[PDB]
């Protein structure tokens, strides 16, 4: 005790590494050396995490899943959020998710997240858990984006007010020499905004949603970074069975995207899924897990799909329906 | 000391290729080799939580503060990744839940922030107050 937790930076830094986020901040105030060590632990948080509301979560009683799940699962999280990504099922017209979430996050944290009829979430406990197409169910995940040195995943929500350049340029969509992927989620305009950056060497991820629930039109994330690598595929009607689905995901894997510091985004037509797959759901996700054992599955089922199969690594065509957008986002490796 | 047991420690593993340990005592040395003996058959270490610490090590780690911290000093000196990580898991488990108002007394942590900078860091980390 005399020289262990002080005068010895490696020990304190490590022990803090074995702490959660809230307690990380709380114990940040203990000592200046401890404060610097938690600063280091924060700078090496170049990862992602998500809460989950999966297996038999609703039951006969759950007590505000969208609140309790996030509150409890903000306890074993190490990454200090810098931007919030989440989802939750929709099922007078009111809402309290924007209250609960925006209250559980730092006052200086932009919030992204949507409510959709269906949502795709990878079960917690391990990234290798089986993704399950939740077309109907009361659930949701909360993907937390910390500050990723050299990766500024800056959100945006541009409304269909009765579109000026400066508005878009502010968030880093246009006139941005670093954007790599966009998350075009459209609630209840989508064309021109998409066009504003379509003619670019990027990857376009997005779809059509019903309503938004948090941000301090169309909402997406201007993924910016050279270390960012990714690709996409269009699982159209031709992908309607195990053979075709697995062939399509083999084509996707042919891009050779790393599985390290990476996310898996699945966008599909609301019709696509269990009913569309002859009384068997998760086929696309089944192939996803089989070929990408560790990557997690995210995105949602929407009435529309935005994306063209493209591949990028260092150095109207996007409008379609009744198809799927297998979108994988890889964040690069730290140093 | 068994050749493989000593090799389990990264620090000693090298010097032999290129057994005095001036910065290690007999008692903590025996503790370390005992832990390795329990961990001798451990699979090669490929969440960092502390709720998954071994029960046998916990009982072996159910020691005084001075004992545990001397063990940590040795493991850092011997670069025994498993031992150091388990002891630090236990220490963090002790820290968890306690606010500075309790941690500072728990480890007699001599304060180092003036009230102004204290409030500055608290406001820079005001989310910490949320549970």
> How would you classify residue A328: left for phi > 0, otherwise alpha for psi between -120 and 50, otherwise beta?
beta
Other C-beta atoms within 10 Å of B128: how many? 21
Q: How do beta strands A114-116 and A211-212 pair? A: antiparallel
Structural domain includes residue B127: no
Rounded to whole angstroms, how far apart are CA atoms A80 and A66? 20
Q: Please report, for residues A86, A118, A171, A267, A310, the alpha-carbon distance to residue A302 in angstroms, rounded to integers and kept in the order given.
A: 15, 8, 25, 7, 21
- Residue A64 carries which DSSP code? -
Rounded to whole angstroms, how far apart are CA atoms A197 and A301? 24
Q: Residue A18 contacts by C-beta under 8 Å, 6 or more apart in sequence? A: B48, B49, B50, B85, B88, B89, B92
Burial A93-131 (b: 16+ CB within 10 A, else e): eeeebeebbbebbbeebbbbbbbbbbbbbbbbeebebeb
> How would you classify residue A151: left for phi > 0, otherwise alpha for psi between -120 and 50, otherwise beta?
beta
Rounded to whole angstroms, how far apart are CA atoms A157 and A298? 20
Would you say A252 and A233 are in contact if contact means Cβ atoms under 8 Å apart? yes
Rounded to whole angstroms, how far apart are CA atoms A248 and A284? 9
Q: Residue A170 contacts by C-beta under 8 Å, 6 or more apart in sequence? A: none
Rounded to whole angstroms, how far apart are CA atoms A147 and A151? 8
- Residue A228 carries which DSSP code? -
Q: Which residue has the tokens 């700078």?
A: A43
CATH code of the domain containing B85: 3.30.710.10
Structural domain includes residue B101: no
Other C-beta atoms within 10 Å of B24: how many? 18
Task: State the count of interchain CB pairs (< 8 A) between A and B.
Answer: 96
Q: Kindly tell me the burial class for residue A170, based on how many C-beta atoms sit within 10 Å of its own C-beta (0-12, 13-18, 19 or more).
A: middle
Would you say A214 and A102 are in contact if contact means Cβ atoms under 8 Å apart? yes
Q: How do beta strands A132-134 and A118-121 pair? A: antiparallel
Q: Which residues pair with B102 in a beta bridge?
A: none
Residue of B107, B35, B17 whose CA lies nearest to B74: B35
Q: Which residue has the tokens 């083999």?
A: A250
Structural domain includes residue B123: no
Q: Which residues pair with A262 in a beta bridge?
A: A330
Chain A hits for B96, CB-CB cut-off 8 Å, are 19-20, 23
Q: Residue A270 contacts by C-beta under 8 Å, 6 or more apart in sequence? A: A117, A118, A135, A301, A302, A303
**Resolution of the coordinates, Å:** 3.4
Q: Kindly tell me the burial class for residue B109, based on how many C-beta atoms sit within 10 Å of its own C-beta (0-12, 13-18, 19 or more).
A: middle
Q: Please report, for residues A181, A235, A248, A279, the alpha-carbon distance to residue A312 in angstroms, rounded to integers and kept in the order given.
A: 10, 19, 18, 36
Structural domain of B45: 3-96
Rounded to whole angstroms, how far apart are CA atoms A294 and A126? 8
Would you say B104 and B111 are in contact if contact means Cβ atoms under 8 Å apart? yes
Top residue of B64, B76, B82, B92 to mutate, by most chain A CBs within 10 Å, is: B92
> What is the tally of structural domains in chain B?
1
Determination technique used: cryo-EM
Q: What is the 3-state secondary structure (H, E, C) of chain B?
A: CCHHHHHCCHHHHHHHHCCCCCCCCHHHHHHHHHHHHHHCCCCCCCCCCCCCCCHHHHHHHCCCHHHHHHHHHHHHHHCCHHHHHHHHHHHHHHHCCCCHHHHHHHCCCCCCCCHHHHHHHHHHCHHHHCC
Radius of gyration for the alpha carbons in chain A, expressed in angstroms and rounded: 20
Chain A hits for B76, CB-CB cut-off 8 Å, are 8, 10-11
Six token digits for residue B83: 């031992």
User: What size, in residues, is chain A?
Assistant: 335
Nearest CB neighbour to A18, from listed B65, B92, B122: B92
Rounded to whole angstroms, how far apart are CA atoms A37 and A127? 27
Q: Residue A204 contacts by C-beta under 8 Å, 6 or more apart in sequence? A: A181, A182, A184, A194, A198, A232, A306, A307, A308, A310, A318
Structural domain includes residue B118: no
Chain B hits for A35, CB-CB cut-off 8 Å, are 121
Q: Residue B53 contacts by C-beta under 8 Å, 6 or more apart in sequence? A: B61, B86, B89, B90, B93
CA angle B16, B18, B24 (to 5 degrees): 45
Structural domain includes residue B121: no
Rounded to whole angstroms, how far apart are CA atoms A204 and B1? 61
Chain B contact residues (CB < 8 Å to A): 47-50, 65-66, 69, 72-73, 76, 84-85, 88-89, 91-92, 95-97, 99-100, 103-104, 107-110, 112-113, 118, 121-122, 125-128, 130-131
Would you say B30 and B24 are in contact if contact means Cβ atoms under 8 Å apart? no
* A244/chain B closest Cα distance in angstroms: 36
Six token digits for residue A28: 């940040």
Residue A265: helix, strand or coil by DSSP? Answer: strand
User: What size, in residues, is chain B?
Assistant: 131
Would you say A265 and A328 are in contact if contact means Cβ atoms under 8 Å apart? yes
Other C-beta atoms within 10 Å of B88: how many? 25
Six token digits for residue A128: 């290798």
- Residue A193 carries which DSSP code? H
Start-to-end Cα distance in chain B: 48
Structural domain includes residue B82: yes
Q: What is the dihedral of CA A128, A133, A139, A144, to 10 degrees?
A: 50
Burial A277-296 (b: 16+ CB within 10 A, else e): beeebbbbbbbbbeebeebb
Q: What is the dihedral of CA A314, A316, A318, A322, to 10 degrees?
A: -170
Rounded to whole angstroms, how far apart are CA atoms A168 and A159? 11
* A106/chain B closest Cα distance in angstroms: 5
Structural domain includes residue B24: yes
- Residue A276 carries which DSSP code? G
Helices B81-95 & B26-39 angle (0-180, nearest 10):
100
Rounded to whole angstroms, how far apart are CA atoms A154 and A146? 11
Structural domain includes residue B87: yes
Domain boundaries, chain A: 9-43, 45-335
């Amino acid at each position: 005790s005399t020289f262990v937790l002080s005068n010895l930076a490696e020990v304190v830094e490590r022990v803090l590494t074995f702490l959660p986020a809230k307690a990380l901040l709380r114990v940040a105030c203990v000592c200046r050396l401890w404060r610097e060590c938690v600063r280091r632990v924060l700078r090496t948080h170049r990862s992602v995490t998500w809460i989950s509301a999966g297996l038999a979560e609703a039951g006969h009683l759950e007590g505000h899943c969208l609140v309790r799940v996030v509150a409890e699962e903000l306890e074993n999280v190490r990454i200090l959020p810098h931007t919030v990504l989440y989802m939750a099922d929709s099922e007078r017209t009111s809402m309290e998710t924007a209250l609960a979430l925006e209250k559980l996050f730092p006052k200086q944290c932009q919030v992204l997240g949507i409510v959709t009829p269906g949502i795709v979430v990878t079960p917690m406990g391990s990234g290798s858990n089986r993704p399950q197409e939740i077309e109907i169910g009361e659930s949701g995940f909360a993907l937390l984006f910390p500050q990723i040195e050299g990766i500024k995943i800056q959100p945006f929500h541009f409304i269909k007010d009765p579109l000026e350049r400066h508005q878009l340029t502010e968030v880093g969509l246009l006139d941005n020499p670093e954007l790599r992927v966009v998350l075009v989620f459209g609630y209840n305009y989508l064309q021109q905004v998409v066009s504003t950056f379509s003619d670019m060497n990027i990857i376009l991820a997005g779809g059509q949603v019903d309503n938004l629930s948090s941000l301090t039109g169309v909402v997406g994330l201007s993924f910016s970074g050279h270390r960012i690598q990714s690709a996409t595929v269009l699982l159209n009607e031709d992908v309607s069975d195990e053979k075709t689905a697995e062939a399509a995901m083999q084509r996707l894997k042919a891009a050779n995207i790393p599985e390290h510091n990476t996310i898996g985004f699945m966008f599909a037509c609301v019709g696509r899924g269990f009913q569309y797959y002859r009384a068997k759901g998760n086929v696309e996700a089944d192939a996803f897990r089989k070929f990408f054992p560790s990557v997690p599955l995210f995105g949602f089922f929407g009435n529309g799909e935005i994306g063209c199969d493209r591949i990028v690594t260092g150095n109207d065509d996007l409008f379609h329906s009744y198809t799927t957008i297998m979108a994988l986002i890889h964040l690069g490796s730290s140093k | 000391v068994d050749v493989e047991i000593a090799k389990q420690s990264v620090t000693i593993k090298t010097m032999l290729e290129d057994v005095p340990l001036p910065n290690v005592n007999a008692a903590i040395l025996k503790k370390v080799i005992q832990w390795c003996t329990h961990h001798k058959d451990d699979p090669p270490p490929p969440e960092k939580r502390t709720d998954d610490i071994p029960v046998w090590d916990q009982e072996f780690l159910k020691v005084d503060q001075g004992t545990l911290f001397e063990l940590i000093l040795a493991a850092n000196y011997l670069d025994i990744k498993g031992l150091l990580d388990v002891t630090c898991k236990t220490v963090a488990n002790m820290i968890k839940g306690k606010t500075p108002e309790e941690i500072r007394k728990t480890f007699n942590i001599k304060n180092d922030f003036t009230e102004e900078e204290e409030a500055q860091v608290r406001k820079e980390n005001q989310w910490c107050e949320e549970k």
